[PDB]
Design a protein around this ligand. Sequence first.
Ligand SMILES: CC(C)(COP(=O)(O)OP(=O)(O)O)[C@@H](O)C(=O)NCCC(=O)NCCS
Ligand SMILES: *C(=O)CCCCCCCCCCCCC
Ligand SMILES: [Mg+2]
Lengths: 361, 7
Amino acid sequence: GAIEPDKDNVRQEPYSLPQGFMWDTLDLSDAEVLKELYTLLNENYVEDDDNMFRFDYSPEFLLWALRPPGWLLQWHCGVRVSSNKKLVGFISAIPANIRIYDSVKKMVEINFLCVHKKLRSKRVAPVLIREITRRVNLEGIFQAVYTAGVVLPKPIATCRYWHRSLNPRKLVEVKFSHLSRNMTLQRTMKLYRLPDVTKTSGLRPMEPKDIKSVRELINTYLKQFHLAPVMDEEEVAHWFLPREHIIDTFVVESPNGKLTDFLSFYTLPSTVMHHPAHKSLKAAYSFYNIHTETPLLDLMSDALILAKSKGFDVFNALDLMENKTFLEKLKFGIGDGNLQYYLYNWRCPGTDSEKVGLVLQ
Amino acid sequence: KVLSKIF
Ligand SMILES: CC(C)(COP(=O)(O)OP(=O)(O)O)[C@@H](O)C(=O)NCCC(=O)NCCS
Ligand SMILES: *C(=O)CCCCCCCCCCCCC
Ligand SMILES: [Mg+2]
């Protein structure tokens, strides 16, 4: 359970930054500030282990990820250089109802912790963590969930990335992938060829009228996992209604009209930092895929077909939920990255990745 | 948080 009880005293004044820095609460409704945050992340956020790719979250994507129902302006915490007002730090919290084993707790999800490359090792990130903790506590929330590539003490789970090539030649050219150990490039491309049309009957984009049904579908499905979100109708609409270049959700409407399944994946390109011919890698990420009548394998096959039809170069997925049941069959290849999940102020046994039912952007 | 590539 909780390590420390809900506090009886929380600091009311912001924590002190090092000299030369100032706090700024970012209002992403100001296109100027949203562009500043986009630039910060596009130039300084997470890169692959060999520094060839760097996340390229779009401004619209940041709006989708950072303002779900109940979002708070004070939880978009930025840090600027005082002398020239340049944005050099950021961290964010968004509210969520998170079920850990049997306990449904109001928590925050922490994300987008980023400090400018030139202003690192100045102990800015620890102050950012303290300050977001303070701002969350003052709203009456004392647990958090988050993910990281770094191995910190006592993760609740470790998940592995897998990758399904959709544009093998490009992936090989930019060194995201490599030539098969014993096949020509051409035979590799033939190996990963997908059908031109989906197979599942009744597969169609999600629409507003689907909200409640989708809610019903996900909250039931997620019951089997040890860590998972619990979503109300507003949250379902936010996280799953299609937004072009951001989030795609397809539902399976049975003949009578009931929804029986749905698949979803979000759009998250990577900058290719040093290639003479390629500047970006278009990647889809598996989000939440719920099955009650369609086999999960056919579901994810259709997901791959749709991502391909939409011009994606690769389809990524973690080995959580039931994903291990289709990863190898659908020709995913194991990635070189591990994602750890962590709970703040909650002590509980760790679990396996297939018992993790939470996906963060 | 993690930008994985094919191993
Ligand atoms: C990890 C982080 C934020 C530390 O910044 P810092 O201000 O130099 O921390 P300090 O070493 O001074 O305690 C910085 O290296 C960074 O922004 N890396 C890229 C973003 C990232 O990896 N976020 C993941 C959160 S674990
Ligand atoms: C990626 O951006 C996650 C970075 C998480 C850093 C540690 C966050 C610790 C919890 C802070 C919020 C506490 C609210 C009770
Ligand atoms: Mg620093």
